[PDB]
Amino acid sequence: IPGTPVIDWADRNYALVEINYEATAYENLIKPKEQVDVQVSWNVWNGDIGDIAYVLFDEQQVWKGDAESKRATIKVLVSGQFNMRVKLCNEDGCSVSDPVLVKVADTDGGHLAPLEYTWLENNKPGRREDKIVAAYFVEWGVYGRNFPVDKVPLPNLSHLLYGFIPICGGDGINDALKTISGSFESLQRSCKGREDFKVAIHDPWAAVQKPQKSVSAWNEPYKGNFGQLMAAKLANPHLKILPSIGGWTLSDPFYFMHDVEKRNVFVDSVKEFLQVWKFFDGVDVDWEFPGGKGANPSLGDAERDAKTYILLLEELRAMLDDLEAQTGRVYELTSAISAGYDKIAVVNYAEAQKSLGKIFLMSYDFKGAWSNTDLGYQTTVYAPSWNSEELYTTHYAVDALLKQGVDPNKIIVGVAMYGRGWTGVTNYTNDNYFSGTGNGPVSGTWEDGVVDYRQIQKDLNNYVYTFDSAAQASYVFDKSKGDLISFDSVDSVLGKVKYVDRNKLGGLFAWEIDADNGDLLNAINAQF
Numbered sequence: 001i002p003g004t005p006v007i008d009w010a011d012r013n014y015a016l017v018e019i020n021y022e023a024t025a026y027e028n029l030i031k032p033k034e035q036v037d038v039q040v041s042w043n044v045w046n047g048d049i050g051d052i053a054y055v056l057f058d059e060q061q062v063w064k065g066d067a068e069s070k071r072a073t074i075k076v077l078v079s080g081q082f083n084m085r086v087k088l089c090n091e092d093g094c095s096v097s098d099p100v101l102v103k104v105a106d107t108d109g110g111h112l113a114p115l116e117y118t119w120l121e122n123n124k125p126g127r128r129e130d131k132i133v134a135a136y137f138v139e140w141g142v143y144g145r146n147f148p149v150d151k152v153p154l155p156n157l158s159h160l161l162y163g164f165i166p167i168c169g170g171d172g173i174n175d176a177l178k179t180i181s182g183s184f185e186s187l188q189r190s191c192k193g194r195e196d197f198k199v200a201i202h203d204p205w206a207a208v209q210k211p212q213k214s215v216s217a218w219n220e221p222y223k224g225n226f227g228q229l230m231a232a233k234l235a236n237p238h239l240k241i242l243p244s245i246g247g248w249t250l251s252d253p254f255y256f257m258h259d260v261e262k263r264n265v266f267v268d269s270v271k272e273f274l275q276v277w278k279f280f281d282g283v284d285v286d287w288e289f290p291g292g293k294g295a296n297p298s299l300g301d302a303e304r305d306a307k308t309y310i311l312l313l314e315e316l317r318a319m320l321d322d323l324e325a326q327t328g329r330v331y332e333l334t335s336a337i338s339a340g341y342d343k344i345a346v347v348n349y350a351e352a353q354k355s356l357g358k359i360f361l362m363s364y365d366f367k368g369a370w371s372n373t374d375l376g377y378q379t380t381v382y383a384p385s386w387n388s389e390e391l392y393t394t395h396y397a398v399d400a401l402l403k404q405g406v407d408p409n410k411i412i413v414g415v416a417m418y419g420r421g422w423t424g425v426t427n428y429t430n431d432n433y434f435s436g437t438g439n440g441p442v443s444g445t446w447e448d449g450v451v452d453y454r455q456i457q458k459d460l461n462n463y464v465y466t467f468d469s470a471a472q473a474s475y476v477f478d479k480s481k482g483d484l485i486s487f488d489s490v491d492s493v494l495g496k497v498k499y500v501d502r503n504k505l506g507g508l509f510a511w512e513i514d515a516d517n518g519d520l521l522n523a524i525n526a527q528f
């Protein structure tokens with residue numbers, strides 16, 4: 001037999017998409033690869049080098065050539081781990097080297113181990129399987145909120161909506177980000193060298209760079225939120241993850257997509273974003289809002305956005321159909337819309353529903369601390385008891401879609417895992433505190449005027465709970481400091497379940513998943 005081969009030592013951790021953990025811009029953050037080249041070299045002891053040389057990736061041939069070269073380069077196209085051996089053969093016999101393990105990494109998670117969700121707080125099995133149970137995961141939730149992916153109750157979720165995927169752009173294209181200090185500049189340095197109207201990542205640190213659970217290794221190819229979501233889909237194979245493009249602050253570049261086809265600069269970037277990051281399962285368009293009303297009041301055009309919103313979905317659906325035939329997968333195209341009738345009337349969803357698979361009806365933020373005069377329910381199914389035709393309700397918004405011809409199976413009702421409130425509510429009659437006028441926003445968890453549902457339960461004995469069984473809404477009041485907060489309790493959410501049940505609505509989605517302590521998500525998945 002030929003000499004025993006000894007594979008020389010080298011790093012055999014390969015990645016089909018390299019990640020530069022020192023970069024800030026998106027174009028220098030990632031390095032997608034056509035292929036990866038597994039290199040192997042060896043030396044020969046105990047005899048000659050043999051006549052022919054083989055390389056084995058499971059005791060099955062993957063390479064052959066000259067044994068004099070003592071080197072082999074193997075093209076690998078798919079991720080995975082395998083043992084590589086060098087097998088020198090000749091007329092006598094064959095010698096087999098000691099195996100080494102090679103790792104080929106890719107965003108499909110083939111190199112990762114399942115990241116199972118350990119049940120925290122009050123979350124308990126199981127999941128509502130015949131209805132859509134979605135939730136929004138915030139990208140910035142790993143900082144002060146301290147809520148990484150390993151805390152997300154994925155076993156009780158059918159969709160995990162990652163918000164938000166930004167659109168590159170400077171002055172005039174993302175002025176809404178200037179409302180938040182440092183948020184606009186973070187997008188500029190993330191789009192360095194990348195020019196406008198292309199998708200990117202707002203913060204590459206928390207997304208793919210920040211060390212987290214099950215992705216804390218020093219040579220970890222993918223960390224952050226993206227790395228955990230790869231391993232999470234293995235522990236939760238039912239789970240489907242969608243990238244949310246836009247949001248409240250990142251919706252400004254949508255208004256400009258009436259032009260030539262910066263849409264293509266958008267869509268073609270979306271098509272590469274989904275094959276670079278394979279753990280996503282479609283696209284979610286969160287244009288807020290078609291026809292103005294957004295974070296930037298300067299933008300808006302009634303029947304320009306109404307057609308642009310249609311053309312955007314038609315071309316995205318056609319682009320996803322190409323991915324479906326090229327990858328063999330199914331890709332979804334969803335969109336979150338406002339629950340305001342004055343805003344639903346702008347877009348004709350009878351035409352949009354043939355490109356959208358589901359519609360996330362944002363049935364919240366009806367009332368807020370932005371107006372001390374217009375006090376009311378932030379989220380509710382029906383009209384309040386003290387005002388029996390508020391048109392900003394979940395019921396009126398659902399019927400508004402139905403009148404247009406929207407299928408009820410495609411309608412997803414929004415659950416608010418938080419609460420907006422006012423402080424120092426004064427000048428009111430009776431014991432109804434919504435007829436009065438507040439004096440400023442209530443003290444909030446992370447932002448004043450908004451309180452997470454979890455903190456509401458902690459401070460529950462500082463308020464007086466009240467459920468409006470006519471409107472299917474809840475609120476709390478504290479006469480000491482005049483704190484009146486409207487939110488979604490277990491009662492109101494359970495009322496939303498039956499409104500979804502045999503009005504034949506698709507399901508429920510919530511914002512945001514980190515603010516729940518297990519009560520709200522369990523009520524969504526209640527089997528009746």
Ligand SMILES: CC(=S)N[C@H]1[C@H](O[C@@H]2[C@H](O)[C@H]3N[C@@H](C)S[C@H]3O[C@@H]2CO)O[C@H](CO)[C@@H](O)[C@@H]1O
Pocket residue numbers: 136163164180246247248249250286336362365447450511512
């Ligand atoms: C108090 C909070 S959480 N405000 C964040 C805000 O608005 C979100 C969200 O962007 C908007 N899009 C749908 C998915 S839900 C709908 O309402 C939510 C809260 O009202 O979004 C911006 C970023 O766009 C955050 O900076 C705010 O903290």
Ligand SMILES: CC(=O)N[C@@H]1[C@@H](O)[C@H](O)[C@@H](CO)O[C@H]1O
Pocket residue numbers: 010011012013101219
């Ligand atoms: C970046 C890295 O992890 N490099 C190598 C790895 O390829 C190898 O599998 C391991 C043990 O052989 O030793 C590491 O130093």
Ligand SMILES: CC(=O)N[C@@H]1[C@@H](O)[C@H](O)[C@@H](CO)O[C@H]1O
Pocket residue numbers: 107108109230233234278279280281327328329
């Ligand atoms: C990307 C991921 O994590 N898992 C996908 C899965 O969603 C898909 O159904 C399947 C079909 O090819 O391919 C896997 O790689």
Ligand SMILES: CC(=O)N[C@@H]1[C@@H](O)[C@H](O)[C@@H](CO)O[C@H]1O
Pocket residue numbers: 248365368370
């Ligand atoms: C400064 C501020 O809080 N603005 C809020 C925003 O947070 C919220 O997402 C949106 C809902 O439509 O309503 C705006 O008025």
Ligand SMILES: [Cl-]
Pocket residue numbers: 035036037
């Ligand atoms: Cl390579």
